[PDB]
């Protein structure tokens, strides 16, 4: 309904108005949680020739540990260089629906099992026809998402996926000179 | 309405997977037609401190005067410099709302009513609290706007701004290359 609608035209607003990123995303995420449930949100960026993903924001219920505390790490061979090209949302159990998962090559994902985290939600973003980066949510508990559920994080998320790549020019402008 | 979400959706859409920026505006604008009965649109870009507006973005129905056909232009001592604080939409007039109408410090007012345009509305582009452009429409009929109407275009006045911002950044960087 209208739910969806509003919470679009408040981040619209949002973005328009609030000056520090930081600030924005705070709240922008505590709205999406009026739409969606999750415990815990991060926006990654993708770096995909260097095979790269950085920590762009977080709002995290957990702490992981520090080694797995970098804002920047490879990607190579990963899960989640897999989804590059994803064009709709994905929702997925750690545990099951992750060919990865184990402490070997999926340390994150284990360590995130290992923590209690149990659910973990993709939501690709875009710009130019680039996937610039992710929405995530990481839960306890296997959230249920339907169809309509994601398709109204999608649209949500190309909200994001503006808000995202405005602070990703700011900085390329930045350190252009 | 669902008409309306989808709307927002799809230019979050356009915007996240349309690499050119000319068939970016011409796609958003089109589908704007379908909420919104207007003749033409137009997106300016503003210069606060030269106290300039550049057009970025055109799809008139009609011809202008040689004489007002230019890129860049002042807009010092015009009706448009007292919106350049503005949150929200504003529908008007053009011969009744406007003080600046008929005097010669208004020929671009002057020439849309000539060309039989009664209506126009401002809508503000907006990117951390700071107005860099307007979205605005002309029609001959002078239609009601509702408070959800202008809510819309604002909400989705809102990613066109970063849009816009984002192509002035690129610019901007392919100029420092």
């Known amino acids: 309904s209208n739910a969806a609608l509003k919470l679009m035209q408040y981040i619209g ?3 328009g108005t609030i000056r520090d990123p930081q600030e924005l995303f ?9 739409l969606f449930a999750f415990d815990s949100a991060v926006i990654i960026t993708i770096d995909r020739e260097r095979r790269e993903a950085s ?8 702490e992981l540990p520090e ?6 790490r490879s990607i190579a061979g990963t899960w989640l260089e897999g989804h590059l090209d994803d064009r709709t949302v994905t929702v997925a159990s750690i ?3 992750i060919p990865s998962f184990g402490a070997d090559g999926a340390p994150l994902l284990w360590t995130l099992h290992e923590l209690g985290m149990r659910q973990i939600v993709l939501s690709p973003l875009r710009s130019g026809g680039r996937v610039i980066g992710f929405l995530s949510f990481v839960s306890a ?28 020019a700011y900085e390329e402008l930045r350190q252009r000179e």
């Open 13 to 15: 607003d949002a973005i």
């Open 26 to 34: 705070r709240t922008v995420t505590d709205k999406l949680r009026l």
């Open 55 to 62: 920590v762009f924001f977080e709002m995290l219920r957990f």
């Open 67 to 72: 080694q797995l505390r970098h804002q920047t």
């Open 95 to 97: 545990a099951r629906d």
């Open 141 to 168: 508990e296997e959230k249920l998402w339907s169809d309509g559920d994601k398709s109204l994080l999608s649209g949500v998320s190309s909200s994001i996926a503006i808000a995202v790549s405005n602070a990703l």
